[PDB]
């Protein structure tokens, strides 16, 4: 049930990020409307600038969280799909990679590391050789639906909003300002 919980947590993160984008756009458009208005409202403009900055930070945080959740879902899908494939064809893997794979239970640590690195880059070379012809591949039959729903990659709007980086001091001051804003809006 780990795949299912990862999937709906990713969906919840998507919904939260979309929502935060909605409030960010609404605040930006309302601030622009007041700026176009005749009324000065200097304090209103300043607090609207604060609003849009805090909501931009919130959108960036939500996008980052959703990106990490999607990456975790993809990683666990890779883990279990590889697990079942290797449980199917482990004897074939052993037959193909015997000359440097047995003795792992008794080889030294440096020998174990060198052997696994040789197996790793041999597998990398084989994967490149197979991808050379460029045959198209579909998703795994068992878990195709979840991976298709979450998509191959996160949306471009998720990635373009994560370019900016915030220092820990910036992170803590933004968190405090967001908490104060939520408390004020609730009242």
């Amino acid at each position: 049930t780990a795949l299912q919980q990862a999937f709906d947590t990713c969906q919840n993160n998507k919904a939260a990020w979309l929502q935060r984008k909605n409030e960010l756009a609404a605040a930006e458009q309302e601030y622009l409307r007041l700026l176009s208005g005749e009324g000065r409202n200097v304090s209103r403009l300043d607090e609207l600038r604060n609003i849009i900055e805090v909501r931009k930070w919130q959108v960036n945080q939500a996008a980052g969280r959703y990106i990490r959740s999607h990456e975790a879902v993809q990683h666990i899908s890779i883990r279990d799909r590889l697990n079942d494939f290797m449980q199917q064809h482990g004897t074939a893997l052993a037959a193909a990679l015997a000359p440097e794979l047995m003795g792992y239970s008794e080889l030294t640590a440096i020998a174990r590391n060198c052997a696994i690195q040789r197996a790793t880059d041999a597998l990398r070379e084989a994967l490149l050789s197979w991808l050379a012809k460029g045959e198209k591949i579909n998703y795994s039959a068992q878990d195709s639906d979840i991976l298709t729903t979450i998509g191959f990659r996160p949306d471009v709007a998720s990635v373009d909003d994560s370019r900016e980086k915030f220092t820990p001091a910036q992170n803590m001051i933004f968190s405090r300002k967001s908490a104060q804003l939520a408390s004020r809006q609730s009242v």
């Binding site: 820990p168 001091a169 992170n171 803590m172």
Partner: protein, 419 residues
């Protein structure tokens, strides 16, 4: 009902409850008077009411009972304590009394005490058998008080730097010397967070002297342990009263083999209050401060000790320097060699936004070999040796960028010995 739950109740809920009881207008007066009126109404109801708080002895046994939430303010709702129970219970200042309380009758205006069912969170005869604080022999601090939270917080750099900077143990006497605008308040906040996080058993007390109201109201909503604060509005008499109450309560708590921690912001403010409250001794030192005036604060700062039989009292009091007044320098120099732990903060590092701003080479602790193990001690010694030549700003930026790239101080030790 309980008095504390009424005191912690918000004002709007208090006036709503008063309206339910029947009072037409109990909103346009102080909260203490509102609570006093609620007590009047519920005593007229006739039901039994609980009571509790910290006891205080006056000059003639005219005992009072305050609460820590109201910063020990002399309010009308403070519980009267007759000398009779003072005599047959052997109670002094700082005792935590709880039990039945008598509604006052004509001729008096303070709630009397019916009977006690707990003192110092213990049975009264056990409190009688307890030993008085100053008879307990002190030692050096033995139990390490780790500041690193270990949760991998993005702000946790302050606690890690503190752990690598000055060893804090269960019984230290600490000073935080810092110029204005250096981060004393948030350093104390991080220390309080670490105490409430890693060591939930020890009692944590934060005392603020004549601080700004905004910092105060930020303080009660940030720390977990109970916090007492005084603003600059009220005179030095209330500051002295609050400090004496806090130190007596800490002594009473530590008499029960409990661990008490007191954070003082700041010792200079309390020293000035003591200087301006006490009568002149006839001779004044430089800076316009009486020589005897500093006798009282020392007894506070000197209360920190590690008792053999049980419990400990740790005091971390910050001191202000470069403020611009000579008496502040006099107070600092009188306290220069008093505490066994000292942490120096630099204005130059603070103004360059490399936080926490700590002067490493000028900050240290006494008897550090007793607090921690050996291998950690040589690791820290190697760290001090390597970062000693470099300047304070360079040293702090190097520590920051080395500590930020991993999560645990052990990993930092591993990488510094490996590299």
């Amino acid at each position: 009902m309980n008095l504390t739950e009424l005191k912690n109740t918000p004002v709007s809920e208090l006036i709503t409850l008063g309206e339910n009881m029947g009072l037409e207008n109990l909103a346009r007066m102080r909260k203490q008077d509102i609570i006093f009126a609620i007590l009047k109404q519920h005593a007229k109801s006739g039901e039994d009411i609980f009571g509790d708080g910290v006891l205080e002895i006056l000059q003639d046994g005219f005992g009072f009972l305050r609460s820590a939430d109201s910063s020990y303010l002399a309010g009308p709702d403070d519980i009267y304590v007759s000398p009779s129970q003072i005599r047959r219970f052997n109670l002094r200042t700082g005792d935590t009394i709880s039990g039945k309380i008598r509604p006052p009758k004509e001729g008096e205006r303070y709630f009397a005490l019916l009977k006690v069912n707990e003192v110092n969170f213990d049975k009264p005869e056990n409190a009688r058998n307890k030993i008085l604080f100053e008879n307990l022999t002190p030692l050096h601090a033995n139990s390490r008080l780790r500041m690193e939270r270990g949760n991998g917080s993005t702000e946790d750099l302050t606690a890690r730097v503190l752990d690598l900077a000055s060893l804090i143990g269960r019984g230290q006497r600490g000073l935080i010397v810092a110029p204005p605008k250096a981060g004393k308040t948030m350093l104390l906040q991080n220390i309080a967070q670490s105490i409430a996080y890693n060591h939930p058993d020890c009692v944590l007390m934060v005392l603020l002297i004549d601080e700004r109201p905004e910092e105060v109201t930020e303080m009660q909503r940030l720390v977990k342990g109970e916090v007492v604060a005084s603003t600059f509005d009220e005179p030095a008499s209330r500051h002295v009263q609050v400090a004496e109450m806090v130190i007596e309560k800490a002594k009473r708590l530590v008499e029960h083999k409990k661990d008490v921690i007191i954070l003082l912001d700041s010792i200079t403010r309390l020293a000035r209050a003591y200087n301006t409250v006490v009568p002149a001794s006839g001779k004044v030192l430089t800076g316009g401060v009486d020589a005897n005036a500093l006798h009282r604060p020392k007894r506070f700062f000197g209360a920190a000790r590690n008792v053999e039989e049980g419990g400990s009292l740790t005091i971390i009091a910050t001191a202000l320097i470069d403020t611009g007044s000579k008496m502040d320098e006099v107070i600092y120099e009188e306290f220069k060699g008093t505490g066994n732990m000292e942490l120096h903060l630099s204005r130059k590092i603070a103004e360059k936004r490399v936080f926490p701003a700590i002067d490493y080479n000028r900050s240290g602790t006494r008897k550090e070999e007793l607090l921690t193990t050996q291998e950690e001690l040589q690791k820290m010694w190697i760290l001090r040796k390597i970062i000693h030549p470099m300047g304070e700003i360079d040293a702090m930026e190097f520590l920051i960028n080395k500590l930020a790239m991993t999560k645990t101080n052990d990993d930092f030790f591993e990488m510094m010995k490996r590299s």
